Amino acid sequence: GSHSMRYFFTSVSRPGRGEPRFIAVGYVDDTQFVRFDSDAASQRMEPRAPWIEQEGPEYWDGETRKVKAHSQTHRVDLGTLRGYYNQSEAGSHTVQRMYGCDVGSDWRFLRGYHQYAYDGKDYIALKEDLRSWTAADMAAQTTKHKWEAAHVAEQLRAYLEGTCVEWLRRYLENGKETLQRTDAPKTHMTHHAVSDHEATLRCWALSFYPAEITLTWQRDGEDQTQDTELVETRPAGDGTFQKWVAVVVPSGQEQRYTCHVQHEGLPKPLTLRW
C-alpha cells in the first residue's frame, strides 16, 4: 500500500584543512535512487536507479544546484553549532539531517517529517502538524526562535504536502516495474544439532521487498519468544532483503514448532513446519 520518499544528509568536519565531507542520498521506499558525494569527481547528484535516468539535464542541474547549497548550509552549521557548544576547533563533528513524506494506498499525503541532529543526538525537529518545532536543548531553542521568526516551518510544509508528494507520485509511475512490485519472501527451514538432546530450527526469509516483515515462532499454537534468536533485517545487495529467526528445541520435539511469516507480498501469513 503505502510509500515514502526520504532524503538523508550527513556532514563531517575535517579539522586541519578544507570543507566538511558531505554525503546525500535519496530513497523511495527501500530503494536508493540518487546520491551526491563531496569526495567524488563528478561533483553532481548522480542517478542510482534505472528509472531516474529518464530525467533530463534540467532535473540534474537543479538537483545539483540545491544539493550544493545544502552542503554550504551544513558547513556553516558546524561552525555555529561549535560556537553554541563552546567546543574546540580541533575535534571532528557531525551534523545529520533527514526529511521526506509518506503517502497511504491512495498516494495522498499522510505524514511528513524533517529533523536535525548534531553529533548523533536530537537537535531540532518539526512536529507532526508541521507548524512548530521540538528543540531538545537551549542551543536548539535559539535555532527554533530564529526559524520561527523567519517562517521556515511554512516553507517546509508547502514542500512536504506539495512538491515532495507530487514527485513521489511521478517516481512511483515512471518506476512502476520495480517500485510497485512487491517481492514475497522465499522461505525455508534449516535444522542443526547442538548436543544429543537439543536442536536448532532456523526459519529463513530471502529476496523479499520491501524490507518490513514479521517472522515468529509458535509452540503448539502459542507464541514463543524464549530460546529464540532474531537477526536484524539485512540488505542482500541486489535491492532485496533477508532475515532469519531461530529457536532451540529438544530433539524429537521439532514438530510442535511452526515459523510464521508476514509480508505485504503475501495474501496471507505463510506457515512452515520441519
Binding site: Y7, G26, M45, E63, K66, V67, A69, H70, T73, V76, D77, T80, L81, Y99, Y116, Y123, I124, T143, K146, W147, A150, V152, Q155, L156, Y159, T163, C164, E166, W167, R170
Partner: peptide, 9 residues
Amino acid sequence: CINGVVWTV
C-alpha cells in the same frame, strides 16, 4: 526531488 532552499541553525 530535493527541497529548494535551506536555513542555517
